[PDB]
């Protein structure tokens, strides 16, 4: 049976349920069969590396895959590439450095541009504030992590190009609704003239909308989030959170199957020296 296979992170998370449907749907259009696999828990690094390994011994033309960690699947993917399997990295980037040393490569990496995500949620505040503008802040995530710092850049640059906006306080905050509430109230005392605050995660965001529920500024103050969890989504339907910048799972999976099928057609796997393709998929701004 099937000519293509897709390993994902898990399927108890709606994010990955939406990705599966996008690869299936996109398959029915291209004329290719697909088998979608995943290991139960988000922290099953070994159980996914066993999964992938089992698939490698079957006869799949190509295999797209979302790695739990950046190095848990380097040896199976590099093996897969020597056999001539058309691999396509999804969501998070696999350690290319390690992969090089493994003697392998990938046809393409398909992810969401985290900087654009930050500018998308900052730009939403900009337009809502209007000409008048006003003061804003960015509750950052934890330092060292690229994915939250990327949202930190984009959101910063987008408010600097708006010469009617005042960035009061972009300060660190580890991914925590409690610690997000505590630095929230800190900015609301230092600068109580704030009209909105974008947060670099949906966890922090509900902790900042708690600091606005405190001072009972709910309505004037605009909270924004990222990732778009099912929880916060509801919030935004109820007027409790202003908005959140979700990803596009379905398009990431569908684009990933498209690039895999395109490499197969070519009849030759990407050279080692050749860098992979790099498609970014647009983020979505979920609003009332």
From Swiss-Prot:
Claim: Ligase is one of the keywords in the record: no
Task: Show the GO cellular component annotation of the record.
Answer: ATP-binding cassette (ABC) transporter complex, substrate-binding subunit-containing; membrane; outer membrane-bounded periplasmic space
User: Which keywords accompany this UniProt record?
Assistant: Periplasm, Signal, Sugar transport, Transport
InterPro entries the record matches: Peripla_BP_I (IPR028082), SBP_2_dom (IPR025997)
Protein's UniProt keywords contain Ribonucleoprotein: no
Q: Where in the cell is it found?
A: Periplasm
Tell me where it mainly resides: periplasm
Biological process (GO) annotations held by this record are:
D-allose transmembrane transport; D-ribose transmembrane transport; transmembrane transport
Q: Name one GO molecular function term.
A: monosaccharide binding
Checking CDD domains in the record gives: PBP1_allose_binding (cd06320)
Of which family is this protein a member?
Belongs to the bacterial solute-binding protein 2 family.
Q: What does this protein do?
A: Part of the binding-protein-dependent transport system AlsBAC for D-allose.
Identify this protein by name: D-allose-binding periplasmic protein
């Amino acid at each position: 049976a099937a000519e293509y296979a897709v390993v994902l992170k898990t399927l108890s998370n709606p994010f990955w349920v939406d990705m599966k449907k996008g690869i299936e749907d996109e398959a029915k259009t291209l004329g290719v069969s697909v088998d979608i696999f995943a290991s139960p828990s988000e922290g099953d690094f070994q159980s996914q590396l066993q999964l992938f390994e089992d698939l490698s011994n079957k006869n799949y033309k190509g295999i797209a895959f979302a790695p739990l960690s950046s190095v848990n699947l380097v040896m199976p993917v590099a093996r897969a590439w020597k056999k001539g399997i058309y691999l396509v990295n999804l969501d998070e980037k696999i350690d290319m450095d390690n992969l090089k040393k493994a003697g392998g490569n990938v046809e393409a990496f398909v992810t969401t541009d985290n900087v654009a995500v930050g500018a998308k949620g900052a730009s939403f505040i900009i337009d809502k504030l209007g000409a008048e503008g006003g003061e804003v802040a960015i509750i950052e995530g934890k330092a060292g992590n690229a994915s939250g710092e990327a949202r930190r850049n984009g959101a910063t640059e987008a408010f600097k190009k708006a010469s009617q906006i005042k960035l009061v306080a972009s300060q660190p905050a580890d991914w925590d609704r409690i610690k997000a509430l505590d630095v929230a109230t800190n900015v609301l005392q230092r600068n109580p003239n704030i009209k909105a605050i974008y947060c670099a995660n949906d966890t922090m965001a509900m902790g900042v909308a708690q600091a606005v529920a405190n001072a009972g500024k709910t309505g004037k103050v605009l909270v924004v989030g990222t990732d778009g969890i099912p929880e916060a989504r509801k919030m935004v339907e109820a007027g409790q959170m202003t908005a959140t910048v979700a990803q596009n799972p379905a398009d990431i999976g569908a684009t990933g199957l498209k690039l895999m099928v395109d490499a197969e057609k070519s009849g030759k796997v990407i050279p080692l020296d050749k860098a992979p393709e790099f498609k970014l998929v647009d983020s979505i701004l979920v609003t009332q």
